[PDB]
RNA sequence: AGAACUGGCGAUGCGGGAUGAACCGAACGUAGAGUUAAGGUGCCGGAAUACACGCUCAUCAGACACCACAAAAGGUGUUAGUUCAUCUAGACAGCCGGACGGUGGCCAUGGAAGUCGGAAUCCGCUAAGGAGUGUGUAACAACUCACCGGCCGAAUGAACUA
RNA sequence: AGCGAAACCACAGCCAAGGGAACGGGCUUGGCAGAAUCAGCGGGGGCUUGUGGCAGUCAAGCGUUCAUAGCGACAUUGCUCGGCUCUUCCUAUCAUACCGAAGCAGAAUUCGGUAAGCGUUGGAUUGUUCACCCACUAAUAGGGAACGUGAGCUCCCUACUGAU
RNA sequence: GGCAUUGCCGCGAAGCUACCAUCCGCUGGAUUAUGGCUGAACGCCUCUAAGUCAGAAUCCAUGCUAGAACGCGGUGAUGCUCCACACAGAUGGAUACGAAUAAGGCGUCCUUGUGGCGUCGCUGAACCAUAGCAGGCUAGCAACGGUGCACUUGGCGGAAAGGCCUUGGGUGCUUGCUGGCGAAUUGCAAUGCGUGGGGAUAAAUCAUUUGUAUACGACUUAGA
């Protein structure tokens, strides 16, 4: 086997962590660098390949893509790390007062017995014009090279019963640290959209903990360069409808995904297969650099999204496709 | 044959860097400054539903 | 003498320096070495860069991880060097490299406090003038140390913020060296001189 | 790389080569 | 390899040689004090990061041990010598000038003039010019150093030894 | 959950090198090393290299005196009972990488240099295998790790993979 | 269909799981060989000696895996309260420029410089502190300073800041100067902050539940 993947041992968490972060462009205004979500099955996809110089130029091409449930995500804190001779050293993190039940729940292993007294005497540290709070912001604003944001999943929106929000650090590649903080100041408690991190037709890498078996498996793996096909939004009906097909249907197959629910909010559709399995948390980073290849230049024209039920077999797409073929039966009339 | 760490593909994928996919990020960067900043304005509407 | 003798590599010869830094702990002498990176040596560069890698290869067979660990960062480079002349392993030893401390740069609380050197071990003063002589910094780097800069940069800072200091002091004195000058030559004084002072 | 320790079988297998050079010269 | 002789270990500790059957010292009652042997005195290690004169840079120096094997040589590394030769009658290096006349010697031959070759390598002029040391040409030319000479102003070159 | 042996037992059991004697397990010099414990494997117990020897024009020097006691370096003249898996390392490189040389036009070839990063096949023969041939591929390089993987072939200790 | 050591056949989701399938598989330095540039040694020349440019699938980073179980940081939550007990070598001062060393401080004039003039170094053998019962108790003079102590104003320090300065007042002390008292007999040396129970309250574990995990552990979930 491969030597570099040693020790082949258990990951620390269900949530694998972003080892690297994208560099910096100081000319840009402030931008997030990554985003989190949950793996949700595999779907078949067809489109015409507008790749020049190709043996499959302009022809129809069929490929399996994974959909990842990515809800809008909420800031609860900002962090400042100083550069040291010894690397990096978070000198201060600072939070946002109005924390949700989901975030607080991350601070208790036993939520039921608890007196739920968590960010409380810290919330009374907030209760004034600022003073102590605005001090610790100025602390960061003075020193510290990289400014990272504390955020958590909106898991109540999720069709998962795990109920306990995941915390993940995501840094900021917007230039000047004065801007960095004065972007995190305004964006405390505010929910952050998925389409405001990634567009369609983009290369991204993904992180996830791998499908455990019986030691074998259950390692953190990062795959690199994967094209986002579709960014959909939960408020817009007909996600399955392309510019071609245009029949009103959701990307969710008839009766939800395999061991995963209805997709009642925003999602990402990524080329090929993300590591791990459905339910697992994945964090998507924006590829560290600019990989200008014709593999990355092409803007895709999706044709049709296979929304057949993968549980068992799928001969049809919508419930409207069952009774147009069957007609009408016993229990109906 | 050339490696990934060879001098050929390093020079080739250095010239093309300043293409469209530095500006497509900037075109999306405004949507971060638009709808996410509209989330600041939408919650300011509900705060004016509470201040009334 | 002094309880803590913050030294300072800046132009010393990894060896020698060491040795003495060594003896001195063995004879119960709290030291502290600074600016490790500006430590020197003997010979070209493309040497120390050998007389090393070799060292590098070393490492263990069956289990690479358990073996001669090759530290990069200067400090340590020089450490070793020294934990190599002190029967380390034996109370009296451990009891030493217990007494030691080797920072790269010159962080607080030492920034603020006089240092010193160790004749009997400066490039300038031992190397036949004009002869090949390596300078850690590179030599570290060349083989892993990821910071040369941080140090560097987060340096220049220090130097500054200091010199500045200086001044303020140079300004001060001057005044003294002036007061004493004038209120010098009146009896009392005189007298002293006779004795000498 | 080569070593600079003399193993004792050599260090004394030099003496027993040097002794053979003594009796060779005389004859 | 065999023979003779004299030691050492064998019955034998102790200091030294990082460690050891064959090496260095030194043959032992129990102590204190002094002096040393052999070996050392950057640190591990008790003891001069002593003094003095030199030599050496090594891309894994050297501290390698009757200086014994790979060793006879190689090197535009370096320090000293030895023996031949020029040297203000101007040397060494260097741009500059001449570098010729029978003659484009003679056989070879489409073509050979110094220069694809074969056998002689003469003679005259001079300061000095090889019947020629190379580049080049179909053959010539032009260039060439070797030998002078002028411009400059002192030590230089060759073979070797360590 | 109960009941419950024995064999065995000087003593412990980490590597690397050195410890002259097919002796390393305690020593010397290093690397190192944190209590406690469970589950695997079938894991272990200054040698040499490239150009023959014989007679000779050789020809620097050394030979008691010094070519003729005589040797003598590189040259040139004469005759003429093995081989199928899986690990690791070596460069003395077969391909791939970049150069240097060639009457090397181009394509291809030959020789040489730095380099061990990455690769190195399949079929008829076994009276003792002590031979080889066309088929592909970029190329189908040579070796070491001693009874390598013959306790994979015709209830002694611990490395290692992981787990608390 | 009661049953057939898993009765046979047709097909089948869930799973075991495969080149028998699909997706993915990176860019910066520094080099060897080599080609150079300036250019000595050696009044020419020369890629080299001092310099310097480019350059091999190499090297080293970037990226990828793990995270030292005795490496570290930041942040959330209250230990608090009542009783009973228990107590690797300080001895005046770590006395802050940086860079060079075929060079440098320090002072001064400015023509603001690689500037001039002056001067220093040849050891910290210095500097600053340094007298009082191991440092007492009291009387003035002269200064308007030195210094100790809790306070207070403002500022600086993120590399391991966890210290460094300053403003204002109070209170000591002052050996700067002069005093006035005490020292014995110590006999001639032998330095002179945890427990064991309670009470109130933060949380973890067990037990239960879930399965993305699983040999057992461990891991993930859920429950006033």
């Amino acid at each position: 086997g491969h030597l570099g993947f040693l020790p082949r041992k258990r990951a620390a968490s269900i949530r694998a962590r972003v080892k690297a972060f994208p560099k910096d462009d100081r000319s840009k205004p402030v931008a997030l660098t990554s985003f989190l979500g949950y793996k949700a099955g595999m779907t078949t996809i067809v489109r015409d390949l507008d790749r020049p110089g190709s043996k499959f130029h302009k022809r129809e091409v069929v490929e399996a893509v994974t959909v990842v449930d990515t809800p809008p995500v909420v800031v609860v804190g900002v962090v400042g790390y100083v550069e040291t001779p010894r690397g990096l050293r978070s000198l201060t993190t600072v939070w946002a007062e109005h924390l949700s039940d989901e975030v607080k729940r991350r601070f208790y292993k036993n939520w039921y017995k608890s007196k739920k007294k968590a960010f409380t005497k810290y919330s009374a540290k907030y209760a004034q014009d600022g003073a102590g709070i605005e001090r610790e912001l100025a602390r960061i604003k003075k020193y510290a090279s990289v400014v990272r944001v504390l955020v958590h999943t909106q898991i109540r929106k999720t069709p998962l019963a795990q109920k306990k929000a995941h915390l993940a650090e995501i840094q900021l590649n917007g230039g000047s640290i004065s801007e960095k903080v004065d972007w995190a100041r305004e964006h405390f408690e505010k929910t952050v959209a998925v389409d405001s991190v990634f567009e369609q037709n983009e290369m991204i890498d993904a992180i996830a903990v791998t499908k455990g078996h019986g030691q074998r498996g259950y390692h953190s793996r990062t795959s690199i360069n994967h094209k986002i096909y579709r960014v959909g939004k939960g408020d817009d009906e007909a996600n399955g409808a392309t510019s071609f097909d245009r029949t009103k249907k959701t990307i969710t197959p008839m009766g939800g995904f395999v061991h995963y629910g209805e997709i009642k909010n925003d999602f990402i559709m990524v080329k090929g297969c993300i590591p791990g399995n459905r339910k697992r948390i994945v964090t998507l980073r924006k590829s560290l650099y600019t990989n200008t290849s014709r593999k990355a230049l092409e803007e895709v024209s999706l044709k049709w999204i296979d929304t057949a039920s993968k549980f068992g077999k799928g001969r049809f797409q919508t419930p409207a496709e069952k009774h147009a073929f069957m007609g009408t039966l016993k229990k109906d009339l | 044959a050339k490696s990934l760490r060879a001098s050929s593909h390093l020079n080739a994928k250095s010239v093309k860097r300043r293409g469209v996919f530095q500006k497509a990020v900037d075109a999306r960067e405004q949507r971060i400054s638009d709808k996410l900043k509209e989330d600041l304005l939408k919650q300011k509407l509900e705060d004016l539903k509470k201040k009334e | 003498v002094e309880p803590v003798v913050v030294i300072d590599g800046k132009g010393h010869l990894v060896g020698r320096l060491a040795s003495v830094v060594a003896k001195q702990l063995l004879n119960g002498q709290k030291i502290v070495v600074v600016r490790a990176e500006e430590l020197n040596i003997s010979g070209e560069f493309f040497r120390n860069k050998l007389k090393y890698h070799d060292f590098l290869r070393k490492a263990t067979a069956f289990n690479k991880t358990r073996g001669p660990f090759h530290f990069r960062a200067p400090s340590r480079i020089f450490y070793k060097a020294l934990r190599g002349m002190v029967s380390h392993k034996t109370a009296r030893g451990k009891a030493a490299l217990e007494r030691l401390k080797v920072f790269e740069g010159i962080p607080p609380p030492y920034d603020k406090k006089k240092r010193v050197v160790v004749p009997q071990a400066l490039r300038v003063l031992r190397l036949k003038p004009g002869r090949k002589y390596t300078t850690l910094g590179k030599l570290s780097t060349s083989v892993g140390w990821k910071y040369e800069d941080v140090v560097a940069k987060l340096e220049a800072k220090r130097k500054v913020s200091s010199a500045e200091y200086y001044a303020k002091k140079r300004a001060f004195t001057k005044k003294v060296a002036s007061a004493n000058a004038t209120a010098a030559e009146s009896d009392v004084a005189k007298q002293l001189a006779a004795l000498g002072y | 790389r080569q070593s600079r320790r003399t193993s004792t079988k050599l260090k004394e297998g030099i003496k027993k080569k040097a002794s053979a050079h003594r009796k060779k010269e005389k004859k």
Side-chain angles (χ1 to χ4, degrees), chain C residues 116-153:
Chain C
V116 25
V117 314
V118 175
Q120 64 155 9
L122 318 280
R123 218 204 40 248
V124 60
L125 256 193
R126 299 277 312 197
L127 280 305
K128 195 163 49 67
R131 193 184 289 281
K132 299 239 127 321
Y133 85 79
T134 318
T135 317
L136 238 90
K138 331 34 179 184
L139 192 48
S140 30
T141 282
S142 82
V143 294
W145 187 46
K146 44 189 97 167
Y147 303 90
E148 195 157 24
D149 335 13
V150 189
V151 134
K153 157 193 175 180

Coordinates of all heavy atoms in Angstrom, one line a residue, chain C residues 116-153:
Chain C
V116 N 25.7 39.7 26.4 CA 27.2 39.6 26.5 C 27.7 38.6 25.5 O 26.9 37.9 24.9 CB 27.7 39.2 27.9 CG1 26.6 38.4 28.6 CG2 28.9 38.3 27.7
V117 N 29.0 38.4 25.5 CA 29.6 37.5 24.6 C 30.7 36.6 25.2 O 30.9 36.8 26.4 CB 30.4 38.2 23.5 CG1 29.5 39.4 23.0 CG2 31.7 38.7 24.1
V118 N 31.3 35.8 24.4 CA 32.3 34.9 25.0 C 33.6 34.9 24.3 O 34.0 33.9 23.8 CB 31.8 33.5 25.1 CG1 32.9 32.6 25.6 CG2 30.5 33.4 26.0
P119 N 34.3 36.0 24.3 CA 35.5 36.0 23.6 C 35.8 34.6 23.3 O 34.9 33.9 22.7 CB 36.5 36.5 24.6 CG 35.7 36.5 25.9 CD 34.3 36.8 25.5
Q120 N 37.0 34.2 23.7 CA 37.3 32.8 23.4 C 36.3 32.1 22.5 O 36.2 30.8 22.5 CB 37.4 32.1 24.7 CG 36.1 32.0 25.5 CD 36.0 30.8 26.5 OE1 37.1 30.2 26.7 NE2 34.9 30.6 27.1
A121 N 35.4 32.8 21.8 CA 34.6 32.2 20.7 C 33.8 33.1 19.8 O 32.5 33.1 19.8 CB 33.8 31.0 21.2
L122 N 34.4 34.0 19.1 CA 33.8 34.9 18.0 C 34.4 34.6 16.7 O 35.7 34.4 16.6 CB 34.1 36.3 18.3 CG 34.0 36.6 19.8 CD1 32.5 36.8 20.2 CD2 34.6 35.5 20.6
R123 N 33.7 34.5 15.7 CA 34.3 34.4 14.4 C 35.4 35.4 14.4 O 36.6 35.1 14.7 CB 33.3 34.8 13.3 CG 33.6 33.9 12.0 CD 33.1 34.5 10.7 NE 33.4 35.9 10.7 CZ 32.5 36.8 10.8 NH1 31.2 36.5 10.8 NH2 32.8 38.1 10.7
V124 N 35.1 36.7 14.2 CA 36.0 37.8 14.4 C 36.9 37.6 15.7 O 36.5 38.0 16.8 CB 35.3 39.1 14.6 CG1 34.4 39.0 15.9 CG2 36.3 40.3 14.8
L125 N 38.0 36.9 15.6 CA 38.8 36.7 16.8 C 39.3 35.3 16.9 O 39.7 34.9 18.0 CB 38.0 37.1 18.0 CG 38.5 38.4 18.6 CD1 37.9 38.6 20.0 CD2 40.0 38.4 18.7
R126 N 39.2 34.5 15.8 CA 39.5 33.1 15.9 C 39.7 32.6 14.5 O 40.5 31.7 14.3 CB 38.4 32.4 16.6 CG 38.1 32.9 18.0 CD 39.1 32.1 19.0 NE 39.1 30.7 18.7 CZ 39.5 29.8 19.5 NH1 40.0 30.2 20.7 NH2 39.5 28.5 19.2
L127 N 38.9 33.0 13.6 CA 39.0 32.6 12.2 C 40.0 33.5 11.5 O 39.9 34.7 11.4 CB 37.7 32.6 11.5 CG 36.9 31.4 11.8 CD1 37.8 30.1 11.5 CD2 36.6 31.4 13.3
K128 N 41.1 32.8 11.0 CA 42.1 33.5 10.2 C 41.4 34.4 9.2 O 40.8 34.0 8.3 CB 43.0 32.5 9.5 CG 44.3 33.1 9.0 CD 45.3 32.0 8.7 CE 44.7 30.9 7.9 NZ 44.3 31.3 6.5
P129 N 41.6 35.7 9.4 CA 40.8 36.7 8.8 C 40.6 36.3 7.3 O 41.5 35.8 6.7 CB 41.7 38.0 8.8 CG 42.6 37.8 10.0 CD 42.9 36.3 10.0
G130 N 39.4 36.5 6.9 CA 39.0 36.0 5.6 C 39.2 34.5 5.5 O 40.2 34.0 5.0
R131 N 38.2 33.8 6.0 CA 38.1 32.4 5.7 C 36.7 31.9 5.7 O 35.9 32.3 6.5 CB 39.0 31.5 6.5 CG 39.1 30.1 6.0 CD 39.9 29.2 6.9 NE 41.3 29.5 6.9 CZ 42.1 29.1 5.9 NH1 41.7 28.4 4.9 NH2 43.4 29.5 6.0
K132 N 36.3 30.9 4.8 CA 35.0 30.4 4.7 C 34.3 30.1 6.0 O 34.9 29.4 6.9 CB 35.0 29.2 3.8 CG 35.5 29.4 2.4 CD 34.4 29.1 1.4 CE 34.2 30.3 0.5 NZ 34.2 31.5 1.3
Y133 N 33.1 30.7 6.2 CA 32.5 30.5 7.5 C 31.0 30.7 7.4 O 30.5 31.8 7.1 CB 33.0 31.6 8.4 CG 32.3 32.9 8.2 CD1 31.1 33.1 8.8 CD2 32.9 33.9 7.5 CE1 30.4 34.3 8.6 CE2 32.2 35.1 7.3 CZ 31.0 35.3 7.9 OH 30.3 36.5 7.7
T134 N 30.3 29.6 7.8 CA 28.9 29.5 7.6 C 28.1 30.2 8.7 O 28.6 30.4 9.8 CB 28.5 28.1 7.6 OG1 29.4 27.4 6.7 CG2 27.1 27.9 7.0
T135 N 26.8 30.4 8.5 CA 26.0 31.3 9.3 C 24.6 30.8 9.6 O 23.6 31.4 9.4 CB 25.9 32.7 8.7 OG1 27.1 33.1 8.2 CG2 25.3 33.7 9.8
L136 N 24.5 29.6 10.3 CA 23.2 29.0 10.6 C 22.0 29.4 9.7 O 21.7 28.8 8.7 CB 22.9 29.2 12.1 CG 22.8 27.8 12.7 CD1 24.1 27.2 13.3 CD2 21.7 27.8 13.8
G137 N 21.4 30.5 10.1 CA 20.3 31.1 9.3 C 20.1 30.3 8.1 O 19.3 29.4 8.1
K138 N 20.8 30.6 7.0 CA 20.8 29.8 5.8 C 20.8 28.4 6.2 O 19.8 27.6 5.9 CB 22.0 30.0 5.0 CG 22.6 31.4 5.1 CD 22.4 31.9 6.6 CE 23.0 33.2 6.8 NZ 22.9 33.7 8.3
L139 N 21.8 28.0 6.9 CA 22.1 26.6 7.2 C 20.9 25.8 7.8 O 20.6 24.7 7.5 CB 23.3 26.4 8.0 CG 23.6 24.9 7.9 CD1 23.6 24.4 6.5 CD2 24.9 24.6 8.6
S140 N 20.2 26.5 8.7 CA 18.9 26.0 9.2 C 18.0 25.8 7.9 O 18.0 24.7 7.3 CB 18.3 26.9 10.1 OG 18.6 28.3 9.8
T141 N 17.2 26.8 7.7 CA 16.5 26.9 6.5 C 16.9 25.7 5.6 O 16.4 24.6 5.7 CB 16.8 28.2 5.7 OG1 16.1 29.2 6.4 CG2 16.4 28.0 4.3
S142 N 17.9 26.0 4.8 CA 18.4 25.0 3.8 C 17.8 23.6 4.1 O 18.0 22.7 3.2 CB 19.9 24.9 3.7 OG 20.4 24.2 4.8
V143 N 17.2 23.4 5.2 CA 16.9 22.0 5.7 C 15.8 21.9 6.6 O 15.6 20.9 7.3 CB 18.1 21.5 6.4 CG1 19.3 21.3 5.4 CG2 18.5 22.4 7.5
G144 N 15.0 23.0 6.6 CA 13.6 22.9 7.1 C 13.1 24.1 7.8 O 11.9 24.5 7.6
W145 N 13.9 24.6 8.7 CA 13.4 25.7 9.6 C 12.5 26.6 8.8 O 13.0 27.3 7.9 CB 14.5 26.4 10.2 CG 14.1 27.3 11.2 CD1 13.2 27.1 12.2 CD2 14.6 28.6 11.4 NE1 13.0 28.2 12.9 CE2 13.9 29.2 12.5 CE3 15.5 29.4 10.7 CZ2 14.1 30.4 12.9 CZ3 15.8 30.6 11.1 CH2 15.1 31.2 12.2
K146 N 11.3 26.7 9.2 CA 10.3 27.5 8.5 C 9.9 28.8 9.3 O 8.9 28.8 10.0 CB 9.0 26.7 8.2 CG 8.6 25.9 9.4 CD 7.5 24.9 9.0 CE 8.0 23.5 8.7 NZ 6.9 22.4 8.6
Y147 N 10.7 29.8 9.2 CA 10.5 31.0 10.0 C 11.6 32.1 9.7 O 11.4 33.3 9.9 CB 10.4 30.7 11.5 CG 9.4 29.7 11.8 CD1 9.7 28.3 11.8 CD2 8.1 30.1 12.1 CE1 8.7 27.4 12.1 CE2 7.1 29.1 12.4 CZ 7.4 27.8 12.4 OH 6.5 26.9 12.7
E148 N 12.8 31.6 9.4 CA 13.9 32.5 9.2 C 13.3 33.9 9.2 O 13.9 34.8 9.9 CB 14.6 32.3 7.9 CG 16.0 32.9 8.0 CD 17.0 32.3 7.0 OE1 16.5 31.6 6.0 OE2 18.2 32.4 7.2
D149 N 12.2 34.1 8.5 CA 11.6 35.4 8.4 C 11.0 35.9 9.7 O 11.6 36.8 10.4 CB 10.6 35.4 7.3 CG 10.9 34.3 6.3 OD1 11.7 33.4 6.7 OD2 10.2 34.3 5.2
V150 N 9.9 35.3 10.0 CA 9.2 35.7 11.3 C 10.3 36.3 12.2 O 10.2 37.5 12.5 CB 8.6 34.5 12.0 CG1 7.8 35.0 13.1 CG2 7.8 33.7 11.0
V151 N 11.2 35.5 12.6 CA 12.4 35.9 13.4 C 12.8 37.2 12.7 O 12.5 38.3 13.2 CB 13.5 34.9 13.3 CG1 14.9 35.6 13.0 CG2 13.6 34.1 14.6
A152 N 13.6 37.1 11.7 CA 14.0 38.3 10.9 C 13.0 39.4 11.2 O 13.1 40.1 12.2 CB 13.9 38.0 9.4
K153 N 11.9 39.5 10.4 CA 10.9 40.6 10.6 C 10.7 40.9 12.0 O 11.2 41.8 12.6 CB 9.6 40.1 10.0 CG 8.5 40.9 10.6 CD 7.1 40.3 10.3 CE 6.0 41.1 11.0 NZ 4.6 40.5 10.8

